[model samples]
Each structure stands twice: as structure tokens, then as C-alpha cells.
Target: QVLLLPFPATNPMLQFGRRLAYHGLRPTLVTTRYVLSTTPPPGDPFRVAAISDGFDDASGMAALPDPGEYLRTLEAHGARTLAELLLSEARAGRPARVLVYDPHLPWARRVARAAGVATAAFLSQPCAVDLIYGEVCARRLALPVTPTDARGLYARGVLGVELGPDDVPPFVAAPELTPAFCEQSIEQFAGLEDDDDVLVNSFSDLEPKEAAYMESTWRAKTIGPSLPSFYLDDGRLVPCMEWLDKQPPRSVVLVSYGTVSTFDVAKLEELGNGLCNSGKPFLWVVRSNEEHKLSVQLRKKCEKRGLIVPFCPQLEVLAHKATGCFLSHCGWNSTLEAIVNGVPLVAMPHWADQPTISKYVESLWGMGVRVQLDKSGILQREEVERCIREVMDGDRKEDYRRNATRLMKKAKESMQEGGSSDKNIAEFAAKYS
Candidate 1:
């Protein structure tokens, strides 16, 4: 039987696991569910188990000054709790032969090993991203891990890649925010790369040069953008599909921050005015109870041509014929989604892995332009309007849009019968099964 494990910080993994199941792999998603759990949501038809990770305080985590620390502590607890949960499942005669999870949760693999189950560490970012975390972020000099030192080294040629210091992921440049995370990434990724069965969230055609480089360096299998089964009808999620119908083909801009990046009131206002000023119809996902509290005036201002929801059905929105562009934080999942949807992007990287992903979004893939944020870390309204016009109305938009369309074709082919990603994922199953 295929056993799936939870790595809650990695929400995209749930979607990824669902896609794996679409290929007929019967997966039992175990370990942690969400950090906070009431009852599990209604069962999905997909192969999954809504097991709780045992952290019931996900709701209160927003109150914590630093969500990173709160999560780190929660994960520490999950490591042991998940181990016990796995052991119990094994005793109940539903033994798991393999455990797949994010690399940060090394304990899951450790526990799986003790249970004699094989383990695979799934890297959620691209190879270029992996390289940044593994080679660039980890090996920086100045002999210090301070943000200044990191940025300084980034400015030099020490990041192991030639993307320039400005392109370095913010987390590396500002290691202070999550030093534990930083050090742990270096350790876990380094260790896993040497011996563990690793997989990445990317396709060969998206970044062939980087993909080949990663395989050579880390021996990783690229089984990627692993999306849910495409829906030609509205049965899967009807409302979102209808929302798409209302949009104009290549006119509406789809905007979403990955699950974690919350916005504050000021940032929210800036975004509100920016989108309003742009005069483009947009679809935006704004997380509630996180931080941003949009002013009444600002909310009303955007109500004319925008749909603001906590989180809409992302894939459905992307697939809409009317989606003209994507405004994203450049999370790996968002990037993959935009690519698969043939949508160009206005990348506004928030933090951590975002910068590295944005670099590829703009620099390598030709899928987007990075919007400049002020030194204070807020995206100005004028810049937002400019970005929207650039991606949707400006003359340059066609090239980016056409490139996105080109990648989408290849992406579908890669997920098809005997495609490169298909073969790779099949190989992964065989290796573990």
C-alpha cells in the first residue's frame, strides 16, 4: 500500500500527493494534517488520510510574533508525534513501506527508517532554488552567517551561481529571521542530497539546464508541477469555474500569495490602491485573520473590478480563458500553476524562497517581470499599476504571454503518456515500491 505523510509547512505537497494519486498510486496521507484541526474537512475522492499532526493551535500561530518559530516548535513536536502515529499504523497491519515528505522534516524519514519503511524527501522548489539553498546559501563566506555578511557575499560571486547578489533569496541575505531554519536547510539538504531518494517540483523542459545540473549533483528525480487531474467540466469546483466564465480571455489578472505570506494593513492598502489604479479586472486571494486589514475605503475602491476572497480555487481560476496575467509572490507552487495555465506573471516576491523563484520567473523562464518593492518592503500603488499595464497592456506583454503559452504546451506533454516527468515519477514509484 502507498503511504503518504504530512509535512504541514509544505501545503503544496497535499496537492502534489493528490496528483500522484491521479496516476493510480493508492496513497495514505498520514502524519500531521494541519497544525490546527477541528474535524478533518470532508473526505476527498483522492487517496488521502486526514491525520492530524497534533498541533491544534494553528489558529493562534498568527498571534505569535514570528510564525517561523511557532512552526519550528510545532514541527519539533510533530516529529515525535508522527513517529508514534506511523508505528501504530504499522501495528494495525497497514504497514507503510515508504514515507514521502519535505526535507526539513528529517525526523519523519528517521522514524520511517526505524519502521523499515523507505523514505523519499520531496524538494518543493526548483533545481535552481535547490542550488541556492544548498550551494549558495549554505557556503557563503565573511565567515559569518549574518544578513549583512550574507548580502555582502551575495554581492560578490560566492553564491555558487552567477545570478548576482540582488537575485539571492532574502532568507539567505537575512539569516537572522530564521537562523535555525537556515542552518537546518544546509544540514538536511546536504545530508539528503548525498544519500536520500529526492524529488523536485519541476519539469525537464521548464529548466532543462538546471534540471540536468541538479540530477548530476544531487541525484534528484524531477517529477514535477505534478498537478491535479485537469477538469474540462465544472464538477470538481463549480463556483470557481463560473467565476472564470465571467472573466474576459487574457484580460483578468490572477493574484495570490502562497498560503503563508500574510499582508499587513499598510501593505494591503498599497495593494488595494495599486490594483484599483491599474483599472484591470483582477482575482485576488487574501488570507483572513493573518495580518492585513484593508480599510473600508480601500476595499470599496477595489470592489468595482476585483474579486477578493480568502482563497479561491486556484487551478480553476488559472485555467479560465479570461485570465490575462498572474500577480504572484513567486512561490514554487504558484510558479508551476501559472506555467501550467499559460499565464504570464507580475512577480512580487515576499520572503525566503520567493526571491530565488522570482529570479527564475523573470530571468530564466521569460514568464514575468519582477515588480520593485520600496526599501520599506511595501509594493507601491504606482508600481502595481505599472506592472499590470506592463504585463497586460504594454507591448512587452505579448512576448511573455507567448512564452508562457509555449511552456504550457510542453508542460502538458511532459505530464502525458511516456513523457519525461511521467517516466521519472513512475521510476520513483518503482524505486520505493
Candidate 2:
């Protein structure tokens, strides 16, 4: 009766869809063709349908003359193909009652309206970050922000907290994300006024002010901070899990960025040295292509106290008792995983919302410390060891442990029976009827 549609079928996107499934809504995931092909189906609990985003694969998509044209083409084809699918479903007596979409595709609402289906806008970023974009979209601070708008943005800030240069995301900038990205991000709000509901990937307790602000604006609700990561997992302990089993509880540092993160050779070596220097047991996921960047000596050193695998099951590792700290880029998914698993962080943020997430980890959550980078924004091996020690062997270790446990409890309650996120999902589920 409900449909979850994200631009890309990324973990965070599908995570929300699973929430709807949990509430017994039989939510069907509407996705792009390429993802449908590559992804393994999670059958029974939910279903999937595929349509085009004007390209079948990344290679074709990357070949675009301008990525801006990609969005326009997506909407043009999406509106047409999606309308056909909606009607086909209706004819089969399994009509879609609502279409909850990634806000990236505001036009999904338009297509849903034509098919006489309700629509929602699902936001993936933290509500605090979304607040900045909201201000941008409303022209409270205009795009290519003027001094006046910057003053306004700074004056209000996010929840009366002063924003530094690091607090901002790429959207607020005069970006060269090929320039087209800004327009698309701002346009995420284009159809919000017409949407029946707004869903955020945060909980009320986690973001009281930002959540309230979002709710007041578009009647948004917090229904998240969870992921359906088990979809393709082998469910068996990998060799890394065996290594973790041998380490003492709360003794190992797990260093990983998400699947997409690629680091330069110099930075990789620096981090390698830092982990080697840290003198604690570690499990680091270095992508296969990036593995050669670490010199043989570094790998030789790393393998003694650390296991350098090309890939590992991150969710399982995070949940393991022996895993003590996360040295992360603080991407939203990784951040939420650390929080959910009660693992403290050494936030070595790379870009976009990451630094913002690092701010919360150090300032808001008090569950971690951020790494200091050089003036050119390059992190040193010594600095990495320092940050890791700050979590593992520093005076604040217990405090970080305590704060992480507290947030872990909140994350737990948010998904339990009659909890805040649970109730929000329940309420959203009821909308289908």
C-alpha cells in the first residue's frame, strides 16, 4: 500500500523503506533500473519495482555532457514511466496508496499526484544540516549568499549554535560540484509545499530544535536512525570477526570509510602510520584499488597489530564487543552505525556533511574527538595516533564511553515498541489507509 522511492538505492534510502516494512505496510521499493539489476532482492517482507532515471549504468551516467541535464532527463522520463507503473499497480488491485520519495526527486510527487496517490518527501541528512539548506532554499540566505544573508544565517545559526566554516555543507557554498549540484539540492524543496508529509532521518530526542523547526515548516516527522544493512550480508563471521574475537572487549579500533571513500596515497600512508603507531589492535578496511598506496613497510607494520582487509562486514564489526573505537570519515551512515552500536569515534572527517557530523560527535554528543589536520587540511600520522589515543587511552575515554552508551540507549528506545521513531513510523504507516 506504500512505496519507498529513493534516487539511488543506497543503504540509507533502503533503510527507511525497511522501517515501513517493519510496520507491516508491505511497502514496495520503487527504484532505478541499474540498482534493481545489481542489488540482491530482499524478498517476502517487501517487493521492488524498477524504472529509468534516463541511464542504465554509472558508465553511461558519467558520460553525460553536463550532470545538470541528467536531472531534467530523469524527471521527464520518470514522470512518464512512473505514471505507467502506478496505473499498472492500481489495475492489479495492489494500488500504491502513497509514494514516499527521496527529496532529490521532487517531481516524484507530481507523478504520484497524477496517479491519485499521496506523496511524501524523505530527507536523508540530519535535520540540523537540512535547516541550513532550508534557509538557502527560502532565500533567507540566498544561493551565492550575500553578506546580508550570511549575517542572517550566522545570527540564527542552527539552534543558536554559532556556525564556523566547517559547520556548513557543500550546498551553502558557491560550489563547483559542477555548479549544477547546488540548483538540484535547493530544488529538493521545490515540491515540499505540495507533499502530504515530510520524513527525516533523525529522531525527536536526537534533534529537538531542528526537528521542531522542520515539523513547523512542512509537518515533518522524525522516523529514523536505523539501517537495513543485513539485506546482502553473508551472516557468517568473516576472518576479521575471528580476529576481533581474540582481542579483549573494547580494545580494537575499526578504521573504515564507506564504500565510496577514496583517499590520496599520501593521506593513506599517513593514516597507515598512525594506526601502526597507535599500538592498539586494529581492523582497517582499505579498498582493493587503494591498497597499493600503502608502502610495503607500512603494510608489514600494519599486519602485526592490525588486520588490513580489502573489505569487511562493517555493521557486524561495529556490533562486536571487542570493537572499541571507530576512526571514521563521519558519513551519515557510519555515524549512525557508531551511535547505534555504542562505539565511540575518532572523527577524521573528509568532506561535505562529514565535518558537520564531526562537530556533533565532539560537541553535541560528547562521544568522540575530532582529528586535527594541518593548515592545508591534511591529517598527519601523528595526529591520527593522537586522536585514536584520545578515544582509547585518554582521560576522556570513560566519558566518551558513557556518552556513546547514552546515545546507544536513545537509539535503542527510538526503535523499540511504542518508541519515538517507532510511533512516527506507525503514524506514517497509517497514512496509507
Candidate 3:
């Protein structure tokens, strides 16, 4: 049995569980009770074990006053719960052979070590971001104070590419978040160098240099872009998929900023109007909390040529033939989904590591165009429309499409038998077997 530490009910984490199960590893996905309830059902091959996080209510961890405090509490509680779980499983004569845990919850390492179980760090972020953070934490690369400093860091091997200060991840650029972020980074990658292997959610071919760097620094395995087959073809997504079939091929723009992030009322209105004025069909995923605040006029305009769902199956939506372009905040999972589906991107980064991913999107990958904010630090509707036009119908559209398609093919090939990703997974599984 394989023990997986707690993670949110998001696609990336769930997908990891699904992949392990598919490979004939009996994975027990342990998470908080509230998170398990909110998470979509884990079908067939895996079992779910719910543990206490001290917040079983609907609010969960988000309601806490301080983010770091909540994480500290969660780690303490999680370690106790997981320790008991392992002992109980051993009594039942079905003890876990390996522990694959989220690196964000660093305390899991101690728990695994105490239980005499082999461990692997499961990182949901892309390899590039991980390498950058590891370097910053090691004090080898200093955070930038200016554009020249940023370029110097990049040139000296922080990132394999040259990026200005604005291109650095938001956490690196903002002084307020840097200290806390650096502390967390140290905890996250602390024992990784001397401990067991690291599992990254990216393919070797897609991030060769970064993957190689990690393997050399700390034994790393690139075994992902782990999009589950079950979720991709699930019957629950029929309505959304059926809707996409009616639209012309490569004619719709799919807009989603992920589950956690949101925009202010003003920004939301501007984006809504921008989509309407672009004269293109679209599908937008707006969470229920924000759905009620949309303007009536914008909603009506969208009804004529687009669809807006509070939530939908994103992978299925991206896989649909009508999805020509993605207006995204550049989360790693969403970025990988677009690349595998051969869809160009209109990069509109908001926060977190998104700005860094967007830089790679426009500069390194050549897969999308980034939307620049106005001088007033706002994304006006005009800017949004212009980005849409550039990706969907501008002179560079064909070039973007060509590069996206090429990468798409490479991504698909990487997952096939004897390919890099397949080999990585095979090796990991063989070691345990």
C-alpha cells in the first residue's frame, strides 16, 4: 500500500492519486474529512482515508487569520493522525510500503521516517519553478531589487532564460511576501537533498534542462502531466462536451482563473465586457461565490454567444475541439492542459507563481501572448480584447498555433510506451515492486 498525505481536491493532486492506482499500486489518499467530502469521488482503484485537520466545517483552512499559523497547526495535527493511521494499518496486516507526500506539508517527512516507510516528495509545481525556489532558498540566487539584478540572476543560471524583474514570480518581486516565502521554501525542500526521490508533475522532454538539473542536485523523477483517463472521459461532463460539439472547431476561447483566485468587481466587469466585445464564442468558469455579482447586461450578452458555468470539468472542456485559445492565469495544471490540447494561450497572470509561468509561456515556450496591464495597473477591457484578437486572429496566430501543435505532439509522445515519462514511471514502480 502507498500512503499519500493530505492535499486539496484539485485536479493535479487527484490526478496523482489516479495515476498511482492505475499502475497497480494500492494508494490510500489521506486528507481531511471536509476536503474528502468536497473532493470529487475517487473511483475504483484507490481507497480514501479521512483524517482530522481540526477544521471539518465548510470554511476549512481559508477562514484562519494567518496562513502560516494554519499551516503549522495542520502539519502538527496531520502528523499525529497519519502516525495512528499507519500503526492501525500495520495491525490489519496491510501496512503501507511507501509514502508519497506533498512537499508543502513538510512535517509529513518526519511522520514517514518514524513509521519506517520509504518516502518520495510529490511536487505539484513544474520543475522550473521548483529549481528556482530551491536555488533561492539555498542563498545561491538573491531575489531581485531591480531589472538589472533580475537579468544578472537569470544570466548567472537562476532560470535558464533571461527575464526582467517584472517577469520574476510575484512572490519573488513583492518584498512583503519574500521573507515568509523563503522560510517556507527552506522547509519544503529541506531534507530533499539527502532523502528519497522527488516526483515532479512534468515530462522530461517538456522541461529537460530543469528536470536534468533537479536529477543531478537531488534524485528527481519526471513522471507526469498526470491527466487521469477516468476524469477525462467521465460521464458527468457530457453536457459540457456536447455543448462544445455545436461550436465551430477552434472558434471558442475558454476562460478560467482556477478555483482559489478571484478578481475584484471592477476587474470582473471589465473582463466580462471584453469577452462580449471580442465577437467570439467563449466558455467561462465562474465560481458560485462570484457568479451572483456579475452584471445583468454582461450576462445577457454572453448568453447570445457563450456559456458560463459556475464550475465544469476543465480537462474535458480544454480537450474539446472548439477550444482554440485559453485566457488563463497560467497555473501549472491549466498550462499543461492547454499545451497537450494544442490550444494557444492569452496569458493574463494575476498573482502567485503565475507571472513566472506566463513569462515561460511567452518567452521560452512560444506558446502564447502575454497581456500587459495599463499604466494605472489595471487590465482594461480593451487590453483584454486586444490579447484575444492577437491569439485568435492576429498575424502571429498561425505561428502560435504551429508551436502549440508541435508541443502537443511531443507531449503526447512522451506519455506513450518506452517514452521518457513512461520510463520514469516504470522505473519508480519497479523500485517498489
Candidate 4:
């Protein structure tokens, strides 16, 4: 038996749980009851379980003033409830064998250790990003951290490119932005041990040397892009597909900041202006509530050149032949989706792990260019326009597309039946489930 947990039961964890289940692992995905209140349950064939996250009201984490305190509170409640959950499973003659948890919930290891369950840490970011954190945990990169902490941060073996201030995790790169999360992020490795399995939601070939280092150092296993296989890792319904279809192959830009990222008018105003000025066909996903933030002039201009929807099927959009470039916030999931589809990117990394992803896009993978910001920290129209142009038709366009295509081929092979991801999942289940 196995229990898999991600902070909330998002797509990545949902896919992870069901894929393992499909492989006969029989892992149940654990989620917060607070999240359950707002959405429908997962589909058939995927087992589900619930636990409290210390919030009873609708506001949930938002109701809490401090993220660090909330994480601490969550650990207290989670450890207690998790122990009970394991006990009940044991009583049912199906005790959990392995507990797969996100890095943020380091306390899961302690609970699993006490409950006689095997523990594995699940990281959804790229292996390169994880190695950077590994340095912090090993105390090789000291904290209270700074951009300079990334000064030649990682040794060149796992990666050849050197890290800049922007290449580190936002919590470490700019601690002032989210001091609470910065403390919480570093605490992830406090409970780590040599024996626990460190499974990452990335494929082996995507970051060969990085994966090799983690496999040797942390016993890390590459198991993903953690893509959903419902349609075999592919849909939401949107007519925007019709517009994309009309565009010539590899000529349209799909612009979207991920669901959790929000920008005030100043940022949106500049982004929309830049997007429209690129004069390329675009399809942008802007949440309905945040739609009004873009000035009416820019909104009309974008509509004339493209379509704006609250959401579209991301994998579907990325997979489309017309999606030449992704104007993205560079979240890992989005980045991987673009990678697997061989779509180039124009990155506007807002926070968290995005900056690191952007760095990889530009320097390591040669898949995209990152947008620059002015001294005031505002992303101006020209920078946005310039980045998009660079990714779409710059001098390196052929190489960028070629690099993206090569990685896409590897991703496809990795996810093929009996491929690396499949075999790893099978072996993991054979030993634990």
C-alpha cells in the first residue's frame, strides 16, 4: 500500500497517484478537506483520501496571516492525523509501505518514520533546481541567503552553465519578497536522510547529469513531467483551438501566467502592450476576474490579434502545431509541457522556482529567452517584445526549435510504454506496493 501527498491535490499529484495506481501500486492521493470544499472529486479508478490542513473556514491559508506559521501549524495537525491514518490502514491489513510527500512537507518523513512506513520525497521541479537546493541543505551554500549565494553556486558536473542571482529559487534569490516561504523552503531538507527515496517529477534524459548526481547523492529517481495520462497525458474544452488552427504552423504565441500567479495593472498593462506589439497571432489565458486589469485599449488590441480566455487545455495548446512560442511565467509544469511539445518560450518569470526555470530555458536548454525588467522592477513593453521576438525568430531560432524538438523526442521516449518513467514507476511499485 502507498499514500502520495502533494501540498494540495493538484494535477501533478493527481497524475502521480493514478499513474502509480495504474501500475498496480494502489497509492491513494491525500488532500486537504478544505480543497475538497471548492472542487469536484477525482475521476474513477483513482483512490482518494482526505486530511485536515487546520482550516475549517473557506478562506483556508488566505485566512492565516503568515505562511511560515501556517506551515508549522499544518505540520502539527498533519503528523497527528497522518499517524492515525496509517494506523487505520494497518487495522485494515493494508498498512502503507511508502509515503511520497512534497518537499514542503518535511514532517511527512518524521511521521512515516514513526509509523514504520518507508519515506520518499517528491519534488516536482526540475532536477537542476533540486541540486541547487541540495547545496543549501548541505550547508555548502549558506543562508540567510542572497543572489551572491548563487555565485558559481553549483559545481559544473551536473550542469555546465553557471548560475546567476536570477537562477536561484526566488525564496533564496530574493528573500525579502517572501521571507516566510524562504524559511519554510530551506527547512525541507532538515528531515532528509540517506535511506529515503527522492523521487522527482522529471525524466532521466532531460537532465542526465543532474539526475545522475541526485541519484547518487540523494537516491533520487526521475519519474515524471508527472503528466496526466487520462487522455494519456493530455484536455479542457475551449473553442480557442479553432483560432489556433487557423494560424500558420508555429506562428502563434500562447500567453499565460499559471493559475496561482497574479499581476497588478502596471505589469499587465506593460505585458499586453508588449504582446500586441510583437504583431504575432496570440492566444492568452487571463482569468475572468483579472481580465479587467488590462486597459480597454490593450484588451481590444489583443482581441483583434488574438483571443483571451480564462483558461484553455494547456497540454492541448502546447501540443498544437500553431503554438510556435509560449509567453509564459515559466512555472515547471508549463515549462515541461512546452518542452515535451517542442515549443519555444518567451519567459516572464514572476517568482518561486520560475527564475531558475527561465535560466535553464535560456542558458542550459537553449529553448527560450527571459524577459528583462527595468530598475523599478516593472516589465516594460520593449523587454517583453524583445524576448518574444528572440525566442520566435531570433538568430538562434533554428537551434532553439531544434533543441526543443530533441528534448521532446526524449520526453516522448521516456513516457512511452516500458520507457524510463514507466519502468521506474513499475520498479518502485514492485518494491513497495
State each model's CA lDDT, in order: 0.69, 0.78, 0.76, 0.78
Output the worst ten-in-a-row residue range by lDDT, candidate 2. Answer: 228-237
Q: What is the C-alpha lDDT profile of model 2 across 345-423, one tens digit per residue? A: 9997776668777887888789999898789988898999999998999998899999998988887777666778778
Ranking by lDDT: 2, 4, 3, 1
Clashes of each: 4, 0, 0, 3
lDDT of 4: 0.78
Looking at model 3, how many pairs of residues clash? Answer: 0
Instruction: Name the TM-score of candidate 3.
Output: 0.91
Candidate number with the higher lDDT (1 or 2): 2
Name the best candidate (by lDDT): 2
Clashing pairs in 2: none
Candidates in order: C-alpha RMSD to true structure: 4.5, 3.5, 3.1, 2.9
lDDT of 2 at 93: 93
What tens-digit string does per-residue lDDT give for candidate 3 at 208-262? 7778887777678887777764322322115667889999999998998555435
Which prediction has more favorable lDDT, 1 or 4?
4
List ranges where model 3 is wrong by over 4 Å.
Answer: 37-41, 57-59, 63-65, 144-158, 178-182, 230-239, 258-263
Model number with the top TM-score: 4
How far in Å is the alpha carbon of 4 misplaced in model 2?
Answer: 1.3
Q: What is the Å distance of residue 292 in model 4 from its true position? A: 1.5
Q: Is candidate 1 or candidate 2 better by TM-score?
A: 2
